[PDB]
Amino acid sequence: TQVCTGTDMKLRLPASPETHLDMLRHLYQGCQVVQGNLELTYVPANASLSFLQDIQEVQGYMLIAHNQVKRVPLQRLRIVRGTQLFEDKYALAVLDNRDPQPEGLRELQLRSLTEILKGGVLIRGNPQLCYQDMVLWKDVFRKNNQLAPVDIDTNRSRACPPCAPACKDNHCWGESPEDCQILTGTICTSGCARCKGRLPTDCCHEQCAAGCTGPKHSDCLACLHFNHSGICELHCPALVTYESMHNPEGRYTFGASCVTTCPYNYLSTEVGSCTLVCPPNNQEVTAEDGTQRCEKCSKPCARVCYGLGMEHLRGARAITSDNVQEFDGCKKIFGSLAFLPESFDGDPSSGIAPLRPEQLQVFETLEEITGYLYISAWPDSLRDLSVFQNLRIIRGRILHDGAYSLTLQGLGIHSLGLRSLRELGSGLALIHRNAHLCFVHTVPWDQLFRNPHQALLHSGNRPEEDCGLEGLVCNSLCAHGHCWGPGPTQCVNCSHFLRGQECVEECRVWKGLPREYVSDKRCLPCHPECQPQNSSETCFGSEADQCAACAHYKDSSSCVARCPSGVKPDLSYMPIWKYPDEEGICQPCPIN
């Protein structure tokens, strides 16, 4: 697309360096607006970072830390809004880009960045870096962001070449005549916050953010608040106008844009904003057909199951013996599930018992997670993720490290067993360091994804061709070779009939055990009082009334194990007394 979602990993090491770059690539390739924080970290010496080259806007902060690359190609980046700040104060943080000694970041080259709405700048520990002190920062910082901290270290093990002669003022982002700083704040006339030149004819509209092509609200380089189809405006048009009526111009706010409709995986509020999370004392209602909306509860909200990151589990790290039981009977969890080594080791200092595999069945009910699933430890006695057999959707409205809606890491599992998983609402799946794990590639991951930024990243599992030579392959009854584990329960779809959750070639219509009838490709058992037929069907439905014939006795039209002796109909005093015919037909007893 063009709008994408950033991350939230701060300075923490990537779990998967073998995969980190792929991740950055899948998140940012083609992306123009990052909603969230743009965090580029631990990029090695030779990485290609060219998938960053379309980024024109960061809504949160931008963090460039712990890389060895010499160049970070962000020359189209126009604005960092700073709706979130690093260390709660910096819109731009460039940290520790060096090697343990020549490598390390050399120039920032942010030659399009003409706007920082909120927060300041931190540049520290970057020993090859030049030109960090030749930016006029206060031109960059919005007029009312002028007191933003500038904490810019210039300790260097190299000599900086000057700003190229062609630079009209002595300001630049780098040594080349292309990296000249373009000034759009400090050079303006009067009460003009942003301009394209020194004259008032060059003033930008007040609703523009980084600069302009001309004077109009259709000529902005970026919108200060909201882009309403090519016009920057203070507000999106209301959904309702005042008698009060519906407004056919109505728009929803999504980021710095006015949208006709909320994007996938988002909820609509009455006031027409889009959220990942409802305001307090709301409920999520699924319009019958796809939509979800936030609606305030007139009386007390129905009791709901909160997972990690949410309400009283806001600060909780992991599912544990002290908390598993809060999930009994839960179909929907608002929040996330994470199972870490601590979950299964316990902690003898708090007295926390290790989580027993049996306790995990409290999840057999689970159909939906609004946040993420993160599994970093799992019992060795559980060969698969079968306790989540009925899990249908991981929404990924909250994501681990702000990137992953499904993580399985360093586990001993042999198969997945996630047999109901049909949807990863957003975020990436990361499945790595599971040395005995097969049936990863038998899953049709493209079918669970919902945007083109999502992918499965994988490494260190069992090679697929090594599984495929040991008979760990999809059962042959699974349609299209798609399955989640070995055997006939693990199909994504059955090509034939299902008996319970087992895929079978045939129902027991003529042959078999207890006899069966068919209904919607489903093997269903005849009543136990039906007599199995040697030649024909044994039943045509489930009830005692629906047998070819009775194994024991018959009462009116249904096959029965015993004749009624003294059975009283609901609201009657008169009991029925019967006895079986010589041919097994229940007849009325001659006495009451």
Ligand SMILES: *[C@@H]1O[C@H](CO)[C@@H](O[C@@H]2O[C@H](CO)[C@@H](O)[C@H](O)[C@H]2NC(C)=O)[C@H](O)[C@H]1NC(C)=O
């Ligand atoms: C990144 O680039 C450099 C430069 O090509 C790599 O260093 C080279 O290593 C190869 C392989 O042995 C040598 O043949 C070159 O002569 C080296 N060049 C240098 C720096 O003098 C470096 O290994 C690369 N780093 C990564 C992350 O692979």
Ligand SMILES: *[C@@H]1O[C@H](CO)[C@@H](O[C@@H]2O[C@H](CO)[C@@H](O)[C@H](O)[C@H]2NC(C)=O)[C@H](O)[C@H]1NC(C)=O
């Ligand atoms: C505001 O958003 C509009 C989208 O409505 C952007 O304008 C479109 O940009 C695409 C790709 O850049 C063009 O192909 C279309 O011709 C444009 N359409 C419209 C509605 O003008 C626009 O760039 C954004 N403006 C700002 C200031 O960010």
Ligand SMILES: *[C@@H]1O[C@H](CO)[C@@H](O)[C@H](O)[C@H]1NC(C)=O
């Ligand atoms: C950079 O140099 C000065 C003076 O030599 C020193 O006091 C300062 O602490 C250094 N910066 C860092 C990385 O601490």
